[PDB]
């Protein structure tokens, strides 16, 4: 999707997280590692996922901003090794509680309107404003808000779709 500004940005952020944050608050803390086979991870997993990419961005962009060389995703996985970064996500994440999982996230999400608000019109929305935009995909080009949208709206949407589909089966 293409965004005509910041407060059009931070707005869909705004309205697809609380629908997705919402649809844990009846999910018993007792079924949060409860897997099965019609939907891919666990609700802990789900939020572990969203933890995990929110707070890399955050720190690309810290990061940069403190002069330090960004390696994207992180320093010890590759972006052939995705997999393995989602292990480690669940791993870092995932044995925490859904509540402390969306408090968390919702702190994440806080610290990306700031985001937003701290980066120029410029160094939001047009191409080779930030490094670590430039080094996250390097067979194409695409915006720092771009890296926002795939990371917050889009899988708010479909990890939202995954987790109706696991509470109609396991509540």
């Given at each position: 999707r293409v965004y005509e500004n910041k407060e059009e940005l931070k707005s869909e952020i705004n309205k697809t997280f609380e629908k997705y944050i919402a649809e844990f608050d009846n999910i018993p803390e007792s079924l949060k590692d409860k897997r099965i086979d019609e939907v891919d991870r666990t609700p802990a997993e789900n939020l572990a996922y969203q933890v995990g990419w929110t707070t890399l961005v955050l720190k690309w962009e810290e990061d940069e901003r403190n002069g330090l060389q960004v390696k994207t995703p992180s320093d010890e996985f590759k972006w052939n090794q995705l997999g393995e970064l989602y292990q480690w996500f669940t791993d870092t994440?995932?044995?925490?509680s859904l509540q402390e999982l969306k408090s968390k996230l919702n702190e994440n999400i806080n610290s990306i309107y700031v985001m937003i608000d701290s980066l120029s019109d410029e160094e939001l929305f047009?191409?080779?404003?930030?490094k670590w935009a430039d080094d996250a995909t390097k067979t194409a080009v695409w915006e720092v808000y771009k890296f926002i949208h795939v990371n917050t709206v889009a899988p708010f949407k479909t990890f939202r779709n995954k987790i109706r589909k696991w509470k109609k089966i396991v509540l």
């Open positions: 994440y995932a044995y925490l047009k191409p080779h404003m930030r």
